[PDB]
Amino acid sequence: LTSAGKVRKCTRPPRGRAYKRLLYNKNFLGPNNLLIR
Amino acid sequence: EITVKVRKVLNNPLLQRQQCVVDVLHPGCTYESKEAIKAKVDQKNIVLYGFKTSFGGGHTVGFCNAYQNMDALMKYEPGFRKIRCGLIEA
Amino acid sequence: PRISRHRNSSKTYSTPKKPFTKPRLDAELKLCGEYGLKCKREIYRARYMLAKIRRTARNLLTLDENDIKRRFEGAALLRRLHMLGILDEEKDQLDYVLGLRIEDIFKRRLQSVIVESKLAKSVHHARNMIKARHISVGGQIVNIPSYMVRISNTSRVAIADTSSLA
Amino acid sequence: MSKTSGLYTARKLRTVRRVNRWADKKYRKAHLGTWLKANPLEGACMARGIVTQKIGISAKQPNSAVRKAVRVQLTKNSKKITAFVPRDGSITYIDNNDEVLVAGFGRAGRAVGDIPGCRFKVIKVAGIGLLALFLRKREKRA
RNA sequence: AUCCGGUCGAUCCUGCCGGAGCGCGACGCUCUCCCCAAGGACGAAGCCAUGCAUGCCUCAGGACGCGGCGGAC
RNA sequence: GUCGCGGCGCGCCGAGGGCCCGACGCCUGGCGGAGAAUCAGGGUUCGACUCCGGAGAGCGGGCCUGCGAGACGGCCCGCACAUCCAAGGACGGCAGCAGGCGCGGAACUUGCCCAAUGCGCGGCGCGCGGCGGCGCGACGGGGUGCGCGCGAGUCAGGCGGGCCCACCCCGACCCGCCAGGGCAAGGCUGGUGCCAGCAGCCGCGGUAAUUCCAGCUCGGCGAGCGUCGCGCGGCGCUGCUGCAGUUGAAACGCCCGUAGUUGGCCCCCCGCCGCCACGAGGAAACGGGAGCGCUCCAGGCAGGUUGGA
Numbered sequence: 001l002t003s004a005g006k007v008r009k010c011t012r013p014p015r016g017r018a019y020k021r022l023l024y025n026k027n028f029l030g031p032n033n034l035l036i037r
Numbered sequence: 038e039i040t041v042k043v044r045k046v047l048n049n050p051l052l053q054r055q056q057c058v059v060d061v062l063h064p065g066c067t068y069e070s071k072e073a074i075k076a077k078v079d080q081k082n083i084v085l086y087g088f089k090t091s092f093g094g095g096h097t098v099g100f101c102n103a104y105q106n107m108d109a110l111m112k113y114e115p116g117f118r119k120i121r122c123g124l125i126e127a
Numbered sequence: 128p129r130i131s132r133h134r135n136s137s138k139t140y141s142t143p144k145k146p147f148t149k150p151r152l153d154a155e156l157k158l159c160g161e162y163g164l165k166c167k168r169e170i171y172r173a174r175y176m177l178a179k180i181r182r183t184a185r186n187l188l189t190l191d192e193n194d195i196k197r198r199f200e201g202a203a204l205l206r207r208l209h210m211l212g213i214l215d216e217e218k219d220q221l222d223y224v225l226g227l228r229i230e231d232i233f234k235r236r237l238q239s240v241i242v243e244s245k246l247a248k249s250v251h252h253a254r255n256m257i258k259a260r261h262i263s264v265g266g267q268i269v270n271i272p273s274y275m276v277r278i279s280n281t282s283r284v285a286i287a288d289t290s291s292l293a
Numbered sequence: 294m295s296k297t298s299g300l301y302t303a304r305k306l307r308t309v310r311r312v313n314r315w316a317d318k319k320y321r322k323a324h325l326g327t328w329l330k331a332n333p334l335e336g337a338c339m340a341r342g343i344v345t346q347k348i349g350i351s352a353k354q355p356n357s358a359v360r361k362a363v364r365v366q367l368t369k370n371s372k373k374i375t376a377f378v379p380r381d382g383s384i385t386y387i388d389n390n391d392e393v394l395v396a397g398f399g400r401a402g403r404a405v406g407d408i409p410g411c412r413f414k415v416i417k418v419a420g421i422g423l424l425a426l427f428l429r430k431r432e433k434r435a
Numbered sequence: 436a437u438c439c440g441g442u443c444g445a446u447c448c449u450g451c452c453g454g455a456g457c458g459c460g461a462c463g464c465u466c467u468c469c470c471c472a473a474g475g476a477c478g479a480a481g482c483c484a485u486g487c488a489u490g491c492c493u494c495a496g497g498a499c500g501c502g503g504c505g506g507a508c
Numbered sequence: 509g510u511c512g513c514g515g516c517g518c519g520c521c522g523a524g525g526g527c528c529c530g531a532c533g534c535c536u537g538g539c540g541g542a543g544a545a546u547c548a549g550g551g552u553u554c555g556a557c558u559c560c561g562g563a564g565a566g567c568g569g570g571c572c573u574g575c576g577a578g579a580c581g582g583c584c585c586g587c588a589c590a591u592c593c594a595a596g597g598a599c600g601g602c603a604g605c606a607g608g609c610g611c612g613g614a615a616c617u618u619g620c621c622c623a624a625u626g627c628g629c630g631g632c633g634c635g636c637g638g639c640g641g642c643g644c645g646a647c648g649g650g651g652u653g654c655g656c657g658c659g660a661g662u663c664a665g666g667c668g669g670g671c672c673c674a675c676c677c678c679g680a681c682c683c684g685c686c687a688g689g690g691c692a693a694g695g696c697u698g699g700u701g702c703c704a705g706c707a708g709c710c711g712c713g714g715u716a717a718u719u720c721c722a723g724c725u726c727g728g729c730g731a732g733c734g735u736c737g738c739g740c741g742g743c744g745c746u747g748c749u750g751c752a753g754u755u756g757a758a759a760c761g762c763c764c765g766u767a768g769u770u771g772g773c774c775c776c777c778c779g780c781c782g783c784c785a786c787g788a789g790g791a792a793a794c795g796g797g798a799g800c801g802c803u804c805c806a807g808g809c810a811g812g813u814u815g816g817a
């Protein structure tokens with residue numbers, strides 16, 4: 001055990017009903033597609 | 038306030054009193070106290086209790102014990118209501 | 128014991144069995160769009176409140192048209208379903224209860240009623256106006272968006288006399 | 294009919310079911326009582342103990358790695374277990390006398406994945422949750 | 436009154452392993468407002484400092500005491 | 509002898525009594541029911557704790573007083589443990605309410621009050637019980653905006669309350685937690701190079717990684733999300749409804765045969781079973797269910813001649 005952590009050591013939107021409204025209008029082709037963003 | 042009505046009046050000549058339910062109506066404003074509307078419901082023989090205000094306001098319901106004598110009130114009234122009216126204070 | 132040990136309580140919604148099904152996942156958000164729904168629980172509640180009135184009818188329909196249980200409970204069920212406006216007068220058959228959908232339940236919410244009479248421009252503006260104690264039912268100020276309005280009490284939905292919009 | 298019928302055979306139908314119920318491995322494991330005796334945790338969700346050593350364990354055939362684990366002595370029955378430490382760099386919070394809260398891997402007492410002979414895992418070290426120690430929300434004294 | 440991933444070069448099966456739901460506790464992280472509400476039971480019926488959990492009414496100013504009912508609920 | 513019947517005890521006489529329709533013995537991390545968790549129908553599992561019944565008060569025994577106790581906030585003795593002491597003696601029982609130690613993964617204040625519901629004596633008593641405190645075990649409602657007005661807080665007066673507070677009324681100021689190859693909704697840059705690590709199961713990583721560690725973006729549930737263990741479901745993989753037995757696991761080498769299970773057809777209009785239906789009688793709470801706007805709701809039994817069917 002001398003290697004543990006090797007890679008580790010070497011490396012407001014709207015809320016509630018308004019967030020669901022945002023998703024409703026945003027959706028109504030993939031959500032995280034490359035072409036859109 | 039301006040509107041005071043009473044129902045469910047029961048005469049009780051065993052406890053020397055009369056029991057009532059009182060409805061108080063004050064649309065828009067408060068009714069300021071029980072000591073205020075005590076005039077509409079002598080005065081010193083009236084025992085007012087159990088008043089609740091509904092949601093939004095405008096309505097209040099309470100209960101009245103109206104005695105006829107004065108010994109009767111010091112005899113048949115709970116010992117903490119006589120202190121809420123200042124009548125004894127011990 | 129204490130007296131509070133004798134008080135009842137109950138859960139009022141049922142979660143679905145497969146969470147990650149796409150067609151009902153977007154059908155479930157069209158519903159959150161047409162009505163100002165906070166979260167999925169308010170859909171679940173609705174379905175739960177349907178699943179009971181559907182269980183009653185199917186129990187009575189298995190019975191016979193002249194039994195007293197049908198004559199008593201089906202009449203009670205129909206008389207309750209007509210006052211809330213979940214079911215309408217022209218359908219006074221117990222078999223007309225089975226073809227009911229959730230949308231019929233959602234249409235009698237206060238948030239929906241005030242939109243229909245155009246007191247509010249949309250359903251989101253309606254929810255905001257509900258929270259602001261700006262609307263009264265029969266002279267009684269009601270604060271609850273989810274309030275269920277009976278057909279008797281739908282003539283009498285207004286802005287509250289005590290208000291900053293009066 | 295390969296099963297007895299007849300209006301007065303309830304006793305036989307019950308005896309057959311009582312006898313053949315024990316043939317299922319799930320029922321026998323959960324109802325016999327030998328697994329409860331042999332269980333290091335004694336039928337509990339979790340258990341605390343002290344660390345006696347730090348170790349590295351080879352993986353199984355198609356994988357190649359050195360997994361990090363600790364030998365633990367149980368407080369309540371003095372048994373010997375080995376428990377796995379997940380979450381990169383977490384083996385560095387485990388001194389040789391560190392009270393550890395230990396739970397299971399899932400699978401109700403079966404080894405998972407590629408770690409031979411490991412059925413338990415550390416969830417808390419010296420009073421502090423190990424996951425929050427990795428996520429950098431709390432820290433150990435010194 | 437519903438299934439899905441894993442045995443092969445590919446295929447149809449038997450068969451288990453794994454996943455997906457509800458409940459009860461324990462652990463972690465996190466938390467604005469209001470109503471209801473469980474809370475040392477879980478092979479320790481192990482051990483207990485301190486205070487409180489049972490009193491109320493025939494014969495003389497009163498206590499005190501005697502007598503009485505209760506302390507088995 | 510007992511309140512009383514009885515092998516309950518004693519003397520005498522006889523040899524009975526129970527059993528594969530499972531006796532006897534052993535084991536139980538065994539209190540029983542009303543009930544609870546799960547969910548097509550049939551079922552499986554659990555019955556610590558609210559009501560009803562039983563048993564106990566460190567462990568054995570014994571007893572007095574009383575209508576009623578084999579009483580432990582009564583007494584006596586043995587044992588195992590503690591207490592004060594001038595050393596002669598005296599003395600204890602929280603599985604009551606708080607509180608502490610120990611143990612465990614795991615569980616709150618050494619508060620105020622007899623105002624209510626009831627009980628003893630009649631006026632009091634009561635850690636029954638009531639009211640506050642701690643309380644993300646769990647339940648229910650509403651927010652973090654809408655196209656321009658609110659709530660959370662602040663300060664006053666009411667109402668309420670044994671006294672204070674919370675709720676309600678009037679007045680003036682003002683997310684998070686898990687993920688992103690498949691099961692299963694959701695994809696570009698840097699680092700690392702079978703190492704570190706991930707991964708319930710398939711699998712990923714060998715110096716171009718859709719999976720490790722990070723950044724951006726996106727997905728799900730949401731004041732709540734993830735992990736561990738267990739019950740039920742999934743499961744027609746326990747099968748009565750309803751499995752399988754040529755070759756996948758599975759028909760005794762064969763014949764006889766008791767208990768057990770099963771047994772053709774026929775008389776109708778009696779008796780005795782079973783069976784079907786309807787009654788009587790006994791507990792409520794829970795579970796269903798008629799009626800009622802605690803602002804809705806989880807609730808409750810309310811209420812405006814009434815009602816709790």
Ligand SMILES: [K+]
Pocket residue numbers: 295752
């Ligand atoms: K068969």
Ligand SMILES: [K+]
Pocket residue numbers: 294295296751
């Ligand atoms: K069969």
Ligand SMILES: [K+]
Pocket residue numbers: 295296297
């Ligand atoms: K058979």
Ligand SMILES: [K+]
Pocket residue numbers: 299300301
């Ligand atoms: K038969």
Ligand SMILES: [K+]
Pocket residue numbers: 309313
């Ligand atoms: K069988």
Ligand SMILES: [K+]
Pocket residue numbers: none
């Ligand atoms: K099923």
Ligand SMILES: [K+]
Pocket residue numbers: 441
């Ligand atoms: K396969």
Ligand SMILES: [K+]
Pocket residue numbers: none
């Ligand atoms: K093959």
Ligand SMILES: [K+]
Pocket residue numbers: none
């Ligand atoms: K297969």
Ligand SMILES: [K+]
Pocket residue numbers: 475
């Ligand atoms: K305990």
Ligand SMILES: [K+]
Pocket residue numbers: 476
């Ligand atoms: K106990």
Ligand SMILES: [K+]
Pocket residue numbers: 477537
């Ligand atoms: K246990």
Ligand SMILES: [K+]
Pocket residue numbers: 477
């Ligand atoms: K437990």
Ligand SMILES: [K+]
Pocket residue numbers: 479
């Ligand atoms: K204990």
Ligand SMILES: [K+]
Pocket residue numbers: none
């Ligand atoms: K007595």
Ligand SMILES: [K+]
Pocket residue numbers: 506
């Ligand atoms: K006594």
